[PDB]
């Protein structure tokens, strides 16, 4: 009675495999273990949320209070957590908004369902309960809409759109960053009396150029872009020509050499004497044609030779490398020209227009600025960020990426209508689902009630970060909905929040309809998978 | 639940705890399956010391081979505890718990609860106790049938040893047991019957001695070897020196006073020897024909041995506690401790006392008693394992035959008890019983588990076990309608049925009763257990 | 696929425990394990047998031709081989004769059983076959017996007894070794003819003291005994006749001190003056009663004091040390004295009779001799065994123990009952047992047949060790028994046997004129214990070991 018989199925699967089935207690092991990371996204929620510093294995430090950026770097051994990880990444790549609700609503459905499993309700019935509750949630959100927008062009109308998104990440900066993003969208959208038929928009239109140093208030908007690059050859005129035609060549400016390797063959010395002048006259025949039409700027992606640069210096033509291929096409969108791997000659139809190009230092480093006034632009803009630390500017970039991603979420579908925010529609869904559970008798009614209780974390998480008592403002808020005016009740965050009532229209806090629908679906599908599994099979390392 | 609490632990639950109890049961069953029956295989046990000990008893196999499994240690205590008081039925308990677990485990896989299954074993066990009253047969001890005791002795001895050892050792037990029965009818096994080791000519030369044999003899040469009429004397007083409770120096002053005080060592011994001489003066008549012998429980000083040698008194020292409790039964005398009050009534009687020696050791033989109330069984053997094999055979044979005289009943064996319970449990009306629900298979599981024992006897002979029960089943189908009460058996010589009533195969009453009771308790407790774990400080 | 499950449910027992069933040819391996050391016994049976070196872990070496002796030191792993060790140990303790036979016969019964088990005979029938052969074997040994001793003491009869026994162990020369035993046997025996008394003989009476140096021809037969002692006071040749007296005391020759805190106590100077002289006068006064009885040598049992020694050598009393129990008891049997632990007067009836006590140089060390004369004979005589190598002294000494053990065989049974040796007793049983197989029906006939084939090892071994080809010597001997008993009485074909040295063909010129025979009591228990050795090994079908 000292050594056990060692589980005589040990002839089966190797020691590295670990089984954690149910009955043994898998659900109890999982729902709990994940409460640690549930508090991470809960503390980082709201305008007063705390950012989290994540140092990866390489050492690149990041500080972001989202959920998709954090969990991407966290090497998590627990498999049940990873269902929540890439489910949040789906929200990042598709909509770019709601990572946090997903990590929070998906985890709370597992936390609140502790009562159902512990009481002894069937796991199969719980999946059917949340699925039917999911369908009722999607149908009911359409009726609580009061922000039906149809203009979606002017800048003041975006104050109900961008400023709630920017107010979440770093609440202290609202008017400054909203002016940068809203002015960027106005430059992106074309000037027209009526632009319809689903005009195209992409996240790559608005780029972010991070410059070290300078206060956030000193930032400005640039219609072109700004590269950390050294110009060569001459100083610009900056007002003399009034406009500049810019040719963008994929291939470098050099004598056309083949892909297969060759060399110089000379049978006699007569060709040796003319070979020194032949290379000069060869490029001169191709370079003189470019200068006739007045191309005052050339952009060659590959390395430019010194012989080609020498002929361009005397005529005063600007040169630029732009080695990366992705950022090469964005410059073409500004001027409105096409790429040309052939040398050929410049044509008027394929060549664009650029007002001026000027060179200075913004944060000590010399950069090239492609700002133009009175010119025609189409889907291009940049926001020059000035900040004290690179760690803080990284969060401003992702905040802007989430802001412009919401613009993609609006203009791509037919309607991206608003909803009441600040803990207004979430408590309404608790009343709707509470009334829905009594309409259908059956054993699944317990699942319908507990699905509503999971939505409680949204108001109190704003109160917990605000340093307020949850047991005072949360039940007091229910008395305000008794009865339009009752729909616009929300959670106040201020020193005068003892009353617990603040009107939404005074500050215009709103949320998107499509963002919450996609978040509720991915959250329910995430909880559906974790509650459906019973056995989890590991492996060695 | 146990891993976050204890940093290191092992836990099996709800499928492995059931597989462990069945797999360990089938594993331990396969060890003792081949030993069961008369044609079973022998089994030696040699440790790192190199000694050898040979026997077929399951208790010796279990209580000598260390075992790590938690199930088998309960089978070891169950097989040992049943044999330690009864002396028979060791492997039968292992086969029942070895078979009843696997026979119930098939229905646990079907999804029947362990609680209601064990409820069927308990109510089925009560039916077997009611069946023992009708199945047994009354036997009157006043007849004093010696042939009936010979057949009971051959039941256990044929299982352990062959026919050559059984025929010569059977009447050794019968002559010892024939003296057990008396008017008081009080059974006494440990004090009356004993076993003693002696390396001699062969195991076949075992003989019966009616008196008490002793493993010591006369130290001095001049002391008599053989005595015709020796009247014994029991004295628990120690006749050597005694150190005397803190008493210290014989402070001697002069040299003559030194030896004068050294002579006082003899005065305490001579004070007790004079009482023996005064006792010898009363029985001094016919001194050359008669004799006298003294047996002491503690040591005797060598200075005093010369006193007994001069008077031709045989001296024996350092006897056991058990031998002092047996001289009164053999010689018929009475015991004495102090030398103050003596009488001729306490002296025993012996018709022949002689000594025989081999090598350095010497044995004293006493026999030819007038009315001996006890006796001994001096077993001969060649090797140490030969004595150990005869130890377990005589130990299990005396306990099996002694239980027949305790009660007035005896159970016939050879599968008659198990085959009879099979038809009884499978044909009895269930409405008479109080069990309902899913107790249908519990009756069939325990009833079918009893069939595996009598065919395990056949598995050692090599015949087909399922075919030799065909005519057995056909015999009982016609025996009930033929109006003839007979009990069938299993003869392994020819592979056909037999009758244990005429063949002499029998079994004791409390063996099968305590076996099923101990086996049903252990097998039920192992089924209800659904979790195994190890935890503690070390 | 990469690794087996390595025998599941193996945690029932410990990892060191292993099972060994009859299957997988393991019973054949146990027969092969016997065959390893059995072949060592082939070259050690017979007069041409070769001794064996056995170096123990301590370094004590014993060189020998006897089985029971060689198997004591070898540590054995196989349990079935240990059955042969204890079977031969039983042979040495009881009879002290015929130990190789126990080994060579029981090993060959397992050899021929290798063929029987391979054929398909059940193990239960094999035991029944040899038991039925054993009852017929022991029956016929009593039938074909010829000759008897009929006299306890004779010069020529003992040459027929001792000589064939010691011929196996250290043959050498026949006469010089046999005369040392036959002379010593006559000294210790209580002859007492025409009295009707029961004979008596002890193995511990004849004992050999090993002394280095000399040669085997210079060995003599001493009437008394000998130790390697030194007299303390003085040495004496004792040329005075008119025999001395002997007094044996088991206690030390000193003042009997008090067992409990013997300490002096002197209150005044008057006791201080007399305490020194009191011990002298007290020890002297005890010697007066001892000295007046005419004793001149006292054997002490423990350490003797110096003051007691001063008064002993005053009157010329010899002192002898015997600091052990058995060394003191063996000496009383020579002179026939009754010791008493008291320091008083020895009784005249209890005083022993020894004529002379000499001290001479034999092995370079001091030794004391107690030779008696023809008058007033004694028992427990010794044999001075001289040799060059200490290892040869050990094996020759145990040959005397085997010869003395053979003399024990005459006392218990009714007589001698000698048998023909040199393979004649084995080869005769082959024809009788073979005929017995033809008379009995059943499947046991092959067991009876192979039992006869196993008895061929004695003539096959003696022919192999003798440097002869067994293929020609063995069937030439069968012709003497294939010409079975014709109508003429007094047939002399039973004495034909093998021969180690000499004539070609080999049937020996009788074992007769040669005067070599075997004892019936040795053959009875040898075949009994050899069959038990094969019975216990063949009857077991499963073996379990531990730690190896
Ligand atoms: N000044 C404010 N007053 C009231 N509520 C606010 C204020 N600023 C932000 N909020 C609330 O904080 C919440 C933060 O939500 P967040 O997790 O950023 O949205 P998402 O999950 O879609 O990215 C918003 O729902 C918003 O209603
Ligand atoms: N010669 C025989 N013929 C028929 N049955 C026998 C014979 N010998 C033993 N048995 C049976 O073997 C069973 C076990 O016997 P025993 O060895 O006394 O108990 P255990 O095997 O439990 O130690 C008994 O039930 C008995 O009926
Ligand atoms: N000189 C000889 N000639 C023929 N046979 C002999 C001779 N010496 C010995 N033998 C035979 O060899 C056998 C050897 O017996 P063995 O077992 O060695 O005796 P021990 O028990 O003394 O060792 C004897 O039985 C005897 O018959
Ligand atoms: Mg947001
Ligand atoms: Mg038994
Ligand atoms: Mg011999």
UniProtKB/Swiss-Prot annotation, chain A:
One GO cellular component, as annotated: chaperonin-containing T-complex
Subunit structure: Heterooligomeric complex of about 850 to 900 kDa that forms two stacked rings, 12 to 16 nm in diameter.
GO molecular function ontology, one term from the record: ATP hydrolysis activity
Gene coding for it: CCT8
CDD domains: TCP1_theta
Keyword vocabulary terms for this entry: ATP-binding, Chaperone, Cytoplasm, Isopeptide bond, Nucleotide-binding, Phosphoprotein, Ubl conjugation
Protein name according to UniProt: T-complex protein 1 subunit theta
Organism: Saccharomyces cerevisiae (strain ATCC 204508 / S288c)
Family in the record: Belongs to the TCP-1 chaperonin family.
Curated annotation (Swiss-Prot), chain B:
Superkingdom assignment: Eukaryota
GO molecular function, one term: unfolded protein binding
GO terms, biological process: chaperone mediated protein folding independent of cofactor; protein folding
Keywords on record: Acetylation, ATP-binding, Chaperone, Cytoplasm, Nucleotide-binding, Phosphoprotein
Stated role: Molecular chaperone; assists the folding of proteins upon ATP hydrolysis. Known to play a role, in vitro, in the folding of actin and tubulin. In yeast may play a role in mitotic spindle formation.
Family in the record: Belongs to the TCP-1 chaperonin family.
Subunit structure comment from the entry: Heterooligomeric complex of about 850 to 900 kDa that forms two stacked rings, 12 to 16 nm in diameter.
Protein name, entry field: T-complex protein 1 subunit zeta
Protein encoded by which gene: CCT6
């Amino acid at each position: 009675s000292l050594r056990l018989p060692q589980n005589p199925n040990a002839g089966l699967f190797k020691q590295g495999y670990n089984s954690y089935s149910n009955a043994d207690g898998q659900i109890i092991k999982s729902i709990a273990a994940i409460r640690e990371l549930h508090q991470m996204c809960l503390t980082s929620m709201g305008p007063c949320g705390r950012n989290k510093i994540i140092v990866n294995h390489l050492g690149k430090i990041i500080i972001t209070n989202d959920a998709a950026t954090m969990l991407r770097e966290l090497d998590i051994v627990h498999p049940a957590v990873k269902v929540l990880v890439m489910a949040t990444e789906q929200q990042k790549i598709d909509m770019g908004d709601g990572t946090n609700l997903v990590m929070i609503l998906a985890g709370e459905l597992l936390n609140v369902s502790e009562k159902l499993i512990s009481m002894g309700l069937s796991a199969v019935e719980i999946i059917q309960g949340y699925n039917m509750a999911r369908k009722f949630t999607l149908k009911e959100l359409d009726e609580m809409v009061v922000g039906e927008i149809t203009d979606k062009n002017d800048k003041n109308e975006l104050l109900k759109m961008i400023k709630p998104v920017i107010s979440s990440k770093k609440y202290g900066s609202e008017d400054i960053l909203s002016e940068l993003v809203s002015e960027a969208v106005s430059h992106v959208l074309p000037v027209a009396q009526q632009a319809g038929e689903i005009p195209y928009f992409n996240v790559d239109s608005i780029r972010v150029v991070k410059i070290m140093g300078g206060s956030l208030s000193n930032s400005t908007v640039i219609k072109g872009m700004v590269f950390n690059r050294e110009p060569e050859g001459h100083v610009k005129s900056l007002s003399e020509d009034k406009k500049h035609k810019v040719a963008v060549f994929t291939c470098p400016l050099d004598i056309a050499n083949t892909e297969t390797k060759g060399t110089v063959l000379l049978h006699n010395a007569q060709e040796m004497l003319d070979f020194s002048k032949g290379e000069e006259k060869q490029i001169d025949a191709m370079m003189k044609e470019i200068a006739d039409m007045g191309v005052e700027c050339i952009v060659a992606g590959a390395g430019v030779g010194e012989l080609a640069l020498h002929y361009l210096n005397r005529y005063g033509i600007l040169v630029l490398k732009v080695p990366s291929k992705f950022e090469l096409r964005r410059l073409c969108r500004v001027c409105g020209a096409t790429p040309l791997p052939r040398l050929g000659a410049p044509t008027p139809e394929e060549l664009g227009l650029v007002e001026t190009v000027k060179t200075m230092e913004i944060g000590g480093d010399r950069v090239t600025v492609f700002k133009q006034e009175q010119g025609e632009i189409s889907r291009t803009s940049t926001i020059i960020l000035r900040g004290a630390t690179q760690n803080n500017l990284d969060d401003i970039e992702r905040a802007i990426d989430d802001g412009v991603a919401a613009v993609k979420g609006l203009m791509k579908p037919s309607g991206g209508k608003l909803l009441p925010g600040a803990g207004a529609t979430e408590i309404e869904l608790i009343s709707r689902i509470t009334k829905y559970g009594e309409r259908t008798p059956g054993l699944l009614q317990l699942a319908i009630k507990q699905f509503a209780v999971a939505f409680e974390v949204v108001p109190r998480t704003l109160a917990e970060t605000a340093g307020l008592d949850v047991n005072e403002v949360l039940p007091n808020l229910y008395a305000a909905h008794n009865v339009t005016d009752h729909l616009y009740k929300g959670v106040d965050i201020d020193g005068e929040s003892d009353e617990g009532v603040k009107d939404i229209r005074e500050e215009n806090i709103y949320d998107m309809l499509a963002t919450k629908k996609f978040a509720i679906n991915v959250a329910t599908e995430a909880a559906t998978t974790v509650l459906s599994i019973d056995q989890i099979i590991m492996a060695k390392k | 639940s146990l891993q976050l609490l204890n940093p290191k632990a092992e836990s099996l639950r709800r499928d492995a705890a059931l597989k462990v109890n069945v797999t360990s049961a089938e594993g331990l069953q396969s060890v003792l399956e081949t030993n069961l029956g008369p044609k079973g295989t022998l089994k030696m046990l040699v440790d790192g010391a190199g000694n050898i000990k040979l026997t077929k008893d399951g208790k010796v196999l279990l209580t000598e081979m260390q075992i790590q499994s938690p199930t088998a240690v309960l089978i070891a205590r169950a097989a040992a505890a049943q044999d330690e008081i009864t002396g028979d039925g060791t492997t039968t308990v292992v086969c029942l718990v070895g078979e009843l677990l696997r026979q119930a485990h098939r229905f646990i896989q079907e999804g029947v609860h362990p609680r209601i299954i064990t409820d069927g074993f308990e109510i089925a066990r009560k039916e077997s106790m009611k069946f023992l009253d009708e199945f047994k047969i009354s036997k009157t001890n006043l007849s004093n049938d010696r042939e009936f005791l010979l057949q009971v002795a051959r039941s256990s001895l044929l299982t352990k040893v062959d026919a050559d050892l059984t025929e010569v050792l059977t009447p050794i037990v019968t002559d010892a047991v024939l003296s057990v029965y008396d008017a008081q009818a009080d059974n006494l096994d440990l004090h009356m019957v004993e076993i003693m080791q002696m390396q001699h000519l062969s195991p076949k030369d075992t003989t019966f001695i009616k008196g008490l044999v002793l493993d010591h003899g006369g130290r001095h040469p001049d002391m008599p070897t053989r005595v015709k009429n020796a009247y014994v004397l029991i004295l628990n007083v120690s006749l050597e020196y005694e150190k005397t409770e803190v008493n210290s120096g014989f402070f001697y002053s002069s040299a003559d006073q030194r030896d004068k005080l050294a002579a006082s060592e003899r005065k305490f011994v001579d004070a007790k020897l004079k009482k023996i001489i005064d006792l010898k003066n009363e029985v001094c008549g016919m001194d050359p024909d008669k004799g006298f012998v003294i047996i002491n429980q503690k040591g005797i000083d060598p200075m005093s041995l010369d006193v007994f040698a001069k008077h031709n008194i045989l001296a024996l020292r350092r006897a056991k506690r058990r031998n002092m409790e047996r001289l009164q039964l053999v010689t018929g005398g009475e015991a004495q401790n102090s030398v103050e009050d003596l009488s001729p009534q306490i002296l025993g009687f012996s018709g022949l006392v002689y000594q025989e020696t081999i090598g350095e050791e010497k044995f004293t033989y006493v026999t030819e008693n007038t009315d001996p109330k006890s006796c001994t069984i001096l077993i001969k053997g060649s090797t140490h394992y030969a004595l150990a094999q005869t130890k377990d055979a005589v130990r299990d044979g005396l306990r099996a035959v002694a239980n027949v005289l305790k009660d007035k009943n005896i159970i016939p064996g050879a599968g008659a008890f198990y085959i009879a319970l099979s038809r009884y449990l499978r044909s009895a009306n269930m409405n008479k019983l109080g069990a309902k629900g899913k107790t249908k298979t519990g009756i069939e599981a325990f009833a079918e588990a009893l069939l595996v024992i009598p065919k395990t006897l056949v598995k050692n002979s090599g015949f087909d076990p399922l075919d030799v029960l065909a005519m057995v089943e056909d015999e009982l189908d016609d025996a009930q309608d033929s109006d003839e009460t007979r009990y069938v058996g299993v003869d392994l010589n020819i592979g056909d049925s037999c009758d244990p009533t005429i063949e002499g195969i029998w079994d004791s009453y409390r063996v099968l009763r305590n076996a099923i009771t101990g086996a049903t308790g252990i097998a039920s407790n192992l089924l209800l257990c659904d979790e195994l774990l190890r935890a503690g400080r070390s």
